[PDB]
């Protein structure tokens, strides 16, 4: 397959991004792009997750059937985990620069914290693969009244189980609970976007949650894939790889031709890439302006 990168380094990726061959970038992002914003990863053991509620199994608090009959536990956790402020990271604003420079095809996020929207990505730019707290809906099939985060926040902090003003049904945040399908939008956008992608930028995800992780296998064979992450991720598991074989990351073998791993904090990796691209002053000015604005509204 074609080698579009002149070397398997951040420097090689930057030169490719500055070439006429790189027009359409897809970002895949996870909890690792929001930890520097003080949003802990609810999957991280060190900020791991309630015994009084008698959960049949730990993951029942995020299962749709359990939630609809016993929603109190989930809403108690929602108050406990509610961020003190919503200040997007250097990584979020790097994706805003991709948008500004006409390079952003799509940002696929596993995060529910709304920081991509606050950083200035529009709904059209975004696939919230695991849903979002940004909007909530009445669960009654005939109603489905939509409620904004401002409304849901008041209910969470008041410790009042949120009920629909029209029909008094439960109102659920638009997150994908276990037992719910990923949004139709995820599959529809994936089918179109991965025909068009020139660069896959994977940031702040261990690529362990499916089917989101399998997106890396949907990239054309020639498409360079840059991982910015604290740990190497996306390589075929030596044990699972025996079952399902094709598309796994290859950073370090003699056959490696398009995959690059930059190991460190997402903010530092995005700053390093911005610096190579001549965007460092633009990124600094954007971040300090937006942070100042958020600080003054907080
Ligand atoms: C705007 C806002 C509001 C709030 C309250 N927090 C935040 S960020 C802090 C935080 O982590 N809050 C939080 C609080 C309660 C529960 C949860 C749990 O969130 C989830 C999201 C998606 C999912 N869905 C999936 O992974 C999923 C499903 N199927 N597949 C295949 C994957 C789950 Cl299981 C849980 C998070 N941001
Ligand atoms: Zn309703």
Residue numbers in the entry: 55 to 103, 107 to 302, 304 to 356
Article excerpt on this structure:
Human sirtuin 2 (SIRT2) is an NAD+ dependant enzyme that has been linked to the pathogenesis of various diseases, making it a promising target for pharmaceutical intervention. Sirtuins, belonging to class III histone deacetylases, constitute a family of highly conservative NAD+-dependant proteins that are involved in the regulation of various biological processes such as metabolism, aging, inflammation and oxidative stress. Although sirtuins were initially recognised solely for their deacetylation activity, recent studies unveiled a broader catalytic scope that includes desuccinylation, demalonylation, demyristoylation and ADP-ribosylation. To this end, we expressed human SIRT2 56-356 as a N-terminal His6-SUMO fusion in Escherichia coli and purified the protein via affinity and size exclusion chromatography with tag removal in between.
The most potent and subtype selective SIRT2 inhibitor 29 (RW-78) exhibits an IC50 of 26 nM, which outperforms its lead structure 24a (IC50 = 79 nM) by a factor of 3. Additionally, the chlorine or iodine atom engages in halogen–π-interactions with F235. The spacing between the chlorine atom of 29 and the centroid of the π-system of F235 (3.6 Å) matches the average distance of C–Cl⋯π-bonds (3.854 Å),50 explaining the high potency of 29. Contrary to our design, 29 and 31 do not engage in interactions with the SIRT2 co-factor NAD+ but stabilize the enzyme in an inactive state. In addition, by interacting with the inhibitor, F96 and R97 move into the NAD+-binding pocket, displacing the co-factor and prohibiting NAD+-binding. Therefore, the determined structures do not show electron densities for the co-factor, although 5 mM NAD+ was included in the crystallization screens. Notably, the NAD+ displacement is supported by thermal shift assays, which revealed that 29 increases the melting temperature of SIRT2 independently of NAD+. Compound 29 showed high target engagement with an EC50 value of 15 nM, validating our data obtained from in vitro inhibition studies.
